[PDB]
Amino acid sequence: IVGGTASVRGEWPWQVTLHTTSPTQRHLCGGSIIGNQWILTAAHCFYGVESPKILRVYSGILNQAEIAEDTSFFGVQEIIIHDQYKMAESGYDIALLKLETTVNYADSQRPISLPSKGDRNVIYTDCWVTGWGYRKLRDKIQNTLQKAKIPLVTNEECQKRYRGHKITHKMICAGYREGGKDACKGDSGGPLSCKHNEVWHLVGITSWGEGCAQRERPGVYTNVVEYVDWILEKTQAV
Ligand SMILES: O=C(N[C@@H](Cc1ccccc1)C(=O)NCCc1cc(Cl)ccc1-n1cnnn1)c1ccc2[nH]c(=O)cc(O)c2c1
């Protein structure tokens, strides 16, 4: 996160850090708890990932320093990537992780509500992006979970800023004209969380952008409301 501040412990209790153990253990991506056995994250996070056996999901984390060899985690049973996904910039950048065991909810870890199809008209004015990502394009993974408040941008406004791309209705954008606050490397897969009528909704998944926090270059997020049917289909048993 560029231009953000440290989070308070447990203030983003749906936020997880997804690690890979290969070749040695490290943070891979953000993600969001959406059900007892389910993390929602970005499809591009699994480039080259051959098996779910190398993944570990940590919930209820503020600082990466909390994670040691003796720290408990959730194993991943299955990675489900959208069958139309090819790469982040062309959309469908969405994946589900089915956990091996069930998350026991608490003040430190609980699910975020998916947006309702009826809230596509809502004008969200209290949206936050969070993660352990870089503070600048060339940087490193941060210890403490960062947060930054960022306004949504219209898809017409966003399309003018990315004339070499197709900004689709299945994407949503956020950022300041002057730049300064944005997701960056290591944040992808995490939430764009918007507070509306005292309830948080998972509006976007951190997906892509040209550089980090640049002038007239909004972050681009998977527009989660466009995938509630897919999520429902994919989270069904057998
Ligand atoms: O590049 C990373 N993440 C990419 C995504 C990724 C994931 C897995 C493999 C390859 C790439 C990312 O977050 N990408 C973020 C994409 C992005 C989104 C938005 Cl909304 C706005 C701006 C950006 N940009 C960041 N940089 N340019 N644009 C990444 C992920 C985990 C890491 N762990 C480490 O220990 C050290 C790292 O350097 C590191 C880097």
Domain residue limits, the chain? 1-12+112-226, 13-111+227-238
Cβ contact 19:29 at 8 Å: no
- Is the CB of 93 within 6 Å of ligand 1? no
Specify the DSSP element, H or E, that contains 19: strand 15-20
For residues 155-191, one letter each, b for 16 or more C-beta atoms within 10 angstroms of the residue's C-beta and e for the rest, the string is beebbebbeebebeebbbbbbbeebebbbbbbbbbbb
For residues 231 and 114, what is the distance between their CA atoms, to the nearest angstrom? 10
DSSP state, residue 161: H
For residues 155 and 170, what is the distance between their CA atoms, to the nearest angstrom? 10
CA distances from 25 to 57, 97, 151 (A): 12, 18, 34
Task: Please identify, by atom number, the ligand 1 atom nearest to the C-alpha of residue 140.
Answer: 38
State the residue for tokens 């090819």: 86
Tell the CATH topology of 1-12+112-226.
Answer: Thrombin, subunit H (2.40.10)
Note the helical H segments in 36-162. 155-161
Give the resolution to one decimal, in Å: 1.9
> Is 120 among the annotated ligand-binding positions?
no
Going by C-alpha positions, the residue among 131, 129, 132, 57 that lies closest to residue 95 is 57
The single residue of 32, 188, 193, 207 carrying the catalytic annotation is 188
SS3 assignment, position 53: helix
SS3 assignment, position 97: strand
For residues 10 and 200, what is the distance between their CA atoms, to the nearest angstrom? 14
Q: Is 90 a catalytic residue?
A: no
For residues 48 and 50, what is the distance between their CA atoms, to the nearest angstrom? 6
Specify the DSSP element, H or E, that contains 90: none
**Among protein residues, the one whose CA lies closest to atom 30 of ligand 1:** 186
Q: Is 188 a catalytic residue?
A: yes
**Among protein residues, the one whose CA lies closest to atom 14 of ligand 1:** 185
Going by C-alpha positions, the residue among 13, 120, 5, 115 that lies closest to residue 61 is 13
Cβ contact 31:224 at 8 Å: no
**Among protein residues, the one whose CA lies closest to atom 19 of ligand 1:** 208
Given the candidates 3.30.2130.30, 3.30.70.2190, 2.40.10.10, 1.10.10.920, the CATH classification of the domain at 13-111+227-238 is: 2.40.10.10
Note the helical H segments in 48-166. 155-161
For residues 16 and 114, what is the distance between their CA atoms, to the nearest angstrom? 16
The CA angle 219-220-221, to the nearest 5 degrees, is 120
Q: Is 107 a catalytic residue?
A: no
